């Protein structure tokens, strides 16, 4: 065994505080970790901090911790290889000591000296599993089980989702390559099939999630976990509270932030249009096409940086709103990231599809300061916003114990893994497919090539580039599925407006634009209901097995358990007297 | 005790079959009822049928039946005064004998001779409770508990729903009387408040249902019950099946039935319009107004009869589709009754609001065979369709053991109670409020007067006019709540189209009609989401009490339960050695 039976290693800083407080905090830390059933070995690894090591002290204490974790589990209503054995020890460290034990928050409150705690990689399993499916291009269910046993299943749902999305992506890739050689752009045949794919993928992954969360034993996780909330009073079985009206008021800061960000990006896009008209009039290039579209390509390449800036602003605003639980914090964060994603990514194309193309005759005289807008302008917007941001990234890509501790010190300085920074890009790609893929039908091919190139890069990052996350116990990919549903809904309006407005070359005839919007959205809702109710009747195998197991358990437990006025109830004291009375009555009445 | 401890009385016919088979069926009936723990006394009550009486044989058998019913309950995951004590005996009679016992289906299969089984009324409780709140006009929670202990809670949810609907109805009554003296008809102020009321009532009753089903102990009832399905094969733990594709095909008979019913009622309404134009041209009356609108009032009074005819056709079509469970049967029946309700009730007003008023100049020359259509024509349509159908009904309304058995024989010939025939009328009233109440704002007053007149008539009918239903264990009012939600959604489009088309007197300007439809529907969805998410944070008392009880039970049960490589884990065998090693390391590093 490479790791010397180490489960978790707990980093403990001392450089902030002075000397004689650090020994008191260290003594109460080790006293908590030994009061709960954990063994501890401290040896320093950093110049500024020494980290302790934590394993299960004995088999009886480990079985007690496993039984307590299972009791909290099946009271809330929700060992194995490594996920269960590391999850019960992370609960043993972190769970707030009214239950479970030892109540260690990572760095926030009363525990500001201890830094992040983290398990250790198993480099044999990681290297063999990384080089095993370097030539597979499609993982299997046993393979997702091998990524579930390590890393937990919060990683398992993310990897299963990315593999299922990559498998469903090659139907619009083949279709939008077939509908590009044959029948051009802005086509009803491609638009109806694209909206059907956007419905079917979400309504199929919503079923695959239930199947996968019945296969793995994490069926329903609504066990909410507290976080570093800053309570002002102490209401009273005591708990710190925070009123729902001050959070309501603080949540109204999202409206001026989103309005000002939309106004600023509209100013940037209008500046780019003005510079484009300037280089269109003033001759500046022998090729003249790529040089007249220089600022669009520059801002399309620069959009990830301003998106990351707005992500840090939204993260600080989300920390200001002071959520009590972690589920509501993640929901609010995903909503703010969705708003920033919309404003940054789809507004430079909505702003030129519905404002600048049709109103070119009234905005070109307003933007031609210091003295021909086709739908090809919109098609080149979609090209430069779904191609160049990845072309630029690829072009920047091409250009004794002394051996164990020196890799523990190397793992302790790595960064921390997240799912959201790699799943936001999935949400952006699905928005580009849902909203205005009928403009240029090679958007699914341009996304399939990028996903096929960066297929194993996320697994490489989760193995060797960042430290191992503690095995979480997720049930869904999160609120991103609700974001995908909303994004498909907006796409069924946007794509059907664009197809009416730009196919076959005049007068827009609004009495027909709004009728197309109305009928296409209310056809989307009906088709989504039909696909959802059809897929709810086809049952995947890993939930049928659990339903059959639960029915057999119920049937066995039920087969175990089963194996004055009174002058009325004395005439027929049994069965045979009632039978002969009925015999006499039928013979008398039928005779 | 008036009823001589009789729980259920089981009617058994013999006039269909001959003599010597009836004694065999009677003997196996009494053998089943005595094999399960029930006492039986048979005495004849009809000329054509003799019915047995059923009570619990002993206290040990009654406690065994109660424990078996509770075991099936809390295995499916879902005594008292009369509801529990009669429910366990109805399960003891009916439950299909693989569990529970005695497997008696009422009249369908293998048991065609036995007619409907039924409990007996308690006339003291019924008369005292009927004359107690003859002067109350608003029932209390203890009062709904007294209607829950008798009659079960499938009656309790219906009575609580009708009382809550009557309490919420007097806000649009007072508002539409206030908005009628002041600001006329087709008004935005009344339309926005009417749509807000239609949202708030449904999103408040959806919360009151959870509160009431936590107060009563019927939290989640998804325990599906089989019915008289006609299986063709015997698949194999054996069960008869029916393929989901033959039911799918049989369910496509609803489309030609609804299309032909809509075409027939459109023909009737066009005939009424032609006769109205005929009496408008040919002078026939000194008053001339009521005489020119004679056929509208005649068909508006006749609509309940053709609606009942279409209900029998829809019931036969629903029996043709051969559903396996009773929940899916009730859902499909409620959907067909909703379609018939729409076609019969709101199509004669949609057909004159969106076809005949605006297209009067192109349809009056087509309907004036044998040789002025204002919005007042639409207002008089709404008046004659929401007033005269109840005025006609009110005008037709104004113009030893020998004593116990002679009332058991009287109760055995009564009809059978249902909820659907009195809840369909609620759904029709809510549709008239949701869709086109802005046309004539005294529609809520005309409904409030009718409900206040017929307030206690349903309780009178459930006591003395029909026999007592067995105590069912419902959880919701049913699919009618989903029908009310769909009906409010259609109303937010219809009312906002009518208000644009008919307020302040020309050119319709479609680019504005469809924009009003779009913005009003997507404002309805946002306001419904906001009201639903706001009401999900205000917790009613009877579910907070159950949450506190379950949390205290979990806390008590959790406080009960808690009260080479190895040369690494030998340097510090305990806590004090790790403490002094950490002390030496901090003093060496900080020195
Ligand atoms: C093979 C399809 C039928 C044969 C065909 O190609 O004709 C189409 C017409 O059909 C049509 O619109 C009618 C297509 C009806 C869509 C039905 C598909 C539902 C599939 C589930 C062309 O029209 P489309 O838009 O390609 O012009 C694109 C271009 O002209 C504008 O950039
Ligand atoms: C509008 C109603 C404004 C009343 C706001 C409540 C008035 C009290 C208030 O200002 O709340 C402060 C938070 O800042 C707020 O939420 C005020 C947010 C103002 C942003 C709303 C403008 C957008 C309107 C579209 C308290 O914060 P603190 O630090 O004291 O703890
Ligand atoms: C400009 C407008 C500025 C923005 C104003 C207010 C912030 C929006 C607050 C939205 C509150 C609703 C947020 C929310 O929870 O929606 C969930 C899914 O939708 C989501 O994930 C994301 C939907 C958020 C919609 C906001 C789109 C902004 C578009 C602006 C472009 C201009 C539903 O999940 P559930 O399980 O409850 O069902
Ligand atoms: C959906 C079904 C839609 C129902 C009725 C459409 C009503 C439009 C009738 C008016 C059509 C009048 C017309 O001919 O317009 C021309 C373009 O034609 C056209 O490309 C007409 C084509 C417009 C139809 C667009 C279909 C939307 C595709 C479905 C979306 C996903 C649905 C969800 C499916 C799961 C002018 O063009 P322009 O140069 O002036 O600019
Ligand atoms: C998705 C939202 C859909 C918004 C679509 C914009 C609706 C604007 C529209 O189509 O109507 C034109 C207005 O022309 C007119 O007569 C002008 C008459 C003056 C009345 C003011 C019209 C302003 C429309 C502002 C819309 C809301 C703002 C945009 C919200 C998305 C009709 O033009 P036409 O003759 O071709 O028929
Ligand atoms: C094609 C016809 C296009 C126009 C149709 C209707 C316009 C007016 C209907 C407005 C009511 C909205 C009807 C609707 O789409 O509801 C959805 C599903 O409902 C349905 O499956 C029932 C569809 C009703 C059929 C629409 C009537 C057409 C006849 C929502 O589902 P959810 O999950 O949100 O709950
Ligand atoms: C007191 C309301 C404001 C004062 C007022 O009465 O003026 C109204 C205008 O306000 C208006 O439309 C604007 C009303 C805005 C609606 C806001 C109510 C939301 C309440 C939550 C009249 O307009 P309304 O339609 O009554 O004409 C009906 C009649 O003329 C046509 O049959
Ligand atoms: C359209 C596809 C038609 C194929 C129908 C399936 C073909 C076989 C069939 O007719 O099914 C019969 C039921 O009647 C059916 O459902 C046929 C229903 C036909 C009504 C559909 C027309 C509406 C189309 C809008 C069997 O019944 P049975 O007694 O043998 O047991
Ligand atoms: C003419 C059209 C002829 C009619 C065609 C087909 C029959 C409609 C089948 C609708 C299938 C959907 C029926 C259904 O289950 O909807 C439930 C609620 O809606 C309902 O209770 C009732 C909605 C039914 C919509 C039909 C309106 C007919 C309008 C016709 C007027 C013309 C949703 O519950 P859930 O929990 O699953 O969410
Ligand atoms: C909702 C907000 C709606 C947003 C934009 C409205 C766009 C319409 C702008 C064009 C208005 C042009 C106009 O003046 O039309 C006249 C009537 O005026 C008017 O009564 C205009 C009034 C129309 C507005 C109707 C409001 C619908 C009420 C909300 C429904 C429930 C929402 C859900 C709330 C919970 C002609 O009349 P006519 O003689 O030619 O016939
Ligand atoms: C809810 C559904 C809403 C349906 C509303 C009906 C939409 C009909 C409409 O408003 O467009 C008029 C068509 O006039 C025209 O140019 C006629 C041009 C010929 C094109 C054919 C138009 C037929 C519209 C059939 C609609 C679908 C059927 C109804 C489905 C509910 C425009 O007239 P205007 O000039 O005043 O601007
Ligand atoms: C006022 C503005 C009027 C026009 C607004 C948007 C038009 C395009 C949006 C089309 C997407 C549909 C947005 C929508 O209404 O979704 C509902 C709730 O979502 C929401 O609470 C989020 C509302 C999104 C805010 C709409 C964007 C306006 C900025 C459904 O809820 P459900 O229960 O069915 O799941």
Residue numbers in the entry:
A (entry chain A), B (entry chain B): 11 to 88, 101 to 258, 266 to 400, 420 to 447, 489 to 594, 603 to 660, 701 to 728
From the paper:
TMEM16 scramblases dissipate the plasma membrane lipid asymmetry to activate multiple eukaryotic cellular pathways. The TMEM16 superfamily is comprised of Cl- channels and dual function scramblases/non-selective ion channels. Our results show afTMEM16 thins the membrane to enable scrambling and that an open hydrophilic pathway is not a structural requirement to allow rapid transbilayer movement of lipids. Scrambling by the TMEM16’s is modulated by two signals, binding of Ca2+ facilitates opening of the groove while the properties of the membrane determine whether the scramblase can thin the membrane enough to enable lipid flipping.
In contrast, in C14 lipids scrambling in 0 Ca2+ is ~30% of that seen in saturating Ca2+ so that if scrambling requires groove opening, we expect that a significant portion of particles would adopt a Ca2+-free open-groove conformation. Analysis of a C14/0 Ca2+ afTMEM16 dataset yields only classes with a closed groove, Cα r.m.s.d. ~0.9 Å to C18/0 Ca2+, the highest of which reached 3.3 Å average resolution. Thus, in 0 Ca2+ changing from C18 to C14 lipids induces a ~8-fold increase in scrambling activity that is not accompanied by a concomitant increase in the probability of opening of the groove. This suggests that the basal, Ca2+ independent activity is due to closed-groove scrambling. In the C14/0 Ca2+ map, thickness at the closed pathway qualitatively approaches that at the open pathway of the C18/Ca2+ map, consistent with enhanced scrambling. In the three datasets for apo afTMEM16 (C18/0 Ca2+, C14/0 Ca2+ and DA/EA in 0.5 mM Ca2+) we could resolve 4–9 lipids per monomer, all localized near the dimer interface in positions closely resembling those seen in C18/Ca2+ structure, supporting the notion that these lipids interact strongly with the protein. No lipids could be resolved near the closed pathway in these structures. In thinner membranes, closed-groove scrambling is enhanced allowing for lipid transport in the absence of Ca2+.
